[PDB]
Amino acid sequence: ARNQLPKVVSQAWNMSDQELLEKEGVDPSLETNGNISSSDLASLFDQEEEVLRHGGSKKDGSLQEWANAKWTF
Amino acid sequence: VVSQLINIHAQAVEAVFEDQGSSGNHLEKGLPAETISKLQERLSWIKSIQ
Numbered sequence: 746a747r748n749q750l751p752k753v754v755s756q757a758w759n760m761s762d763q764e765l766l767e768k769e770g771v772d773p774s775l776e777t778n779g780n781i782s783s784s785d786l787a788s789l790f791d792q793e794e795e796v797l798r799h800g801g802s803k804k805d806g807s808l809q810e811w812a813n814a815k816w817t818f
Numbered sequence: 819v820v821s822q823l824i825n826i827h828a829q830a831v832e833a834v835f836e837d838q839g840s841s842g843n844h845l846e847k848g849l850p851a852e853t854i855s856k857l858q859e860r861l862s863w864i865k866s867i868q
Binding site for chain 1: 859
């Protein structure tokens with residue numbers, strides 16, 4: 746159960762606007778074996794989001810894929 | 819014989835909602851003014867969106 750997440754978000758610095766850039770991932774709802782949902786396991790111990798941080802300047806496309814890859818794996 | 823004006827704006831662009839399965843509540847009433855300010859991916863030659 747400790748491997749499941751309730752949600753994942755990624756962050757980086759937006760130098761044009763002078764704020765942070767945040768992107769939320771998308772839950773692929775993968776079809777797997779067994780009869781217990783990943784969403785039942787995820788809520789058991791800690792409902793806070795996972796945060797992927799980078800301190801530099803990133804493009805939106807990259808941040809979105811990073812959050813999605815993390816969740817899928 | 820003509821209607822009264824509210825305003826005149828340069829650099830106007832038209833956009834339409836993409837129907838993806840969900841409940842779009844905002845179709846009951848028009849989306850309020852001032853909600854939108856960004857592209858999905860920043861392209862470097864743009865400054866602000868109103």
